[PDB]
Amino acid sequence: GSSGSSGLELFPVELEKDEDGLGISIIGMGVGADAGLEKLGIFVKTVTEGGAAQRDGRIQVNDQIVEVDGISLVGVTQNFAATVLRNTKGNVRFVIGREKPSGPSSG
């Protein structure tokens, strides 16, 4: 049983580009950095007040775009992610990763 524990809520989120594309910000972070085995994590720095991602409500700030329109934004430098978000078109499928629960909770 080698090391490994990946339990994140990966769900596809459709977004329709607007006069100003999506209208969301991303941040370049280093997830699980193991010297050189680090996996850059593209997170949502913020969401434009009244943007495509905002209006939607689905995508939130601090979110993690694991994938986009199928493109993987894992272990990739912001640049890459930036490029993707720049490649995106009208409709874009953002697969955010939310922390799943673990145990029975009341209300």
Rounded Cα distance, 98 and 22, in Å: 20
**CB contact at 8 A, 73 and 48:** no
Give yes or no for a contact between 24 and 53, defined as CB atoms under 8 angstroms apart: yes
Name the one residue in this structure whose structure tokens are 């199928």.
70
Cβ contacts of residue 48 below 8 Å, gap of 6+?
Answer: 20, 23, 24, 25, 54
Pairing of strands 24-31, 91-99: unpaired
Q: How far apart are the first and last CA of the chain?
A: 35
Which sequence spans correspond to the domains of the chain?
Answer: 1-107
Around Cβ 81, how many Cβ atoms within 10 Å?
23
CA dist 67 and 75 (Å) reads 11
Q: Does domain 1-107 have CATH number 2.30.42.10?
A: yes
Q: Is 88 helix (H, G, I), strand (E, B) or coil?
A: coil
C-alpha distances (whole Å) from 91 to each of 13, 16, 19, 29, 98 are 10, 4, 13, 26, 22
Mapping DSSP to helix (H, G, I), strand (E, B) and coil, where does residue 32 land? Answer: coil
In DSSP terms, 4 is beta-bridged to: none
Number of helices and strands in the chain (H, E)? 2, 6
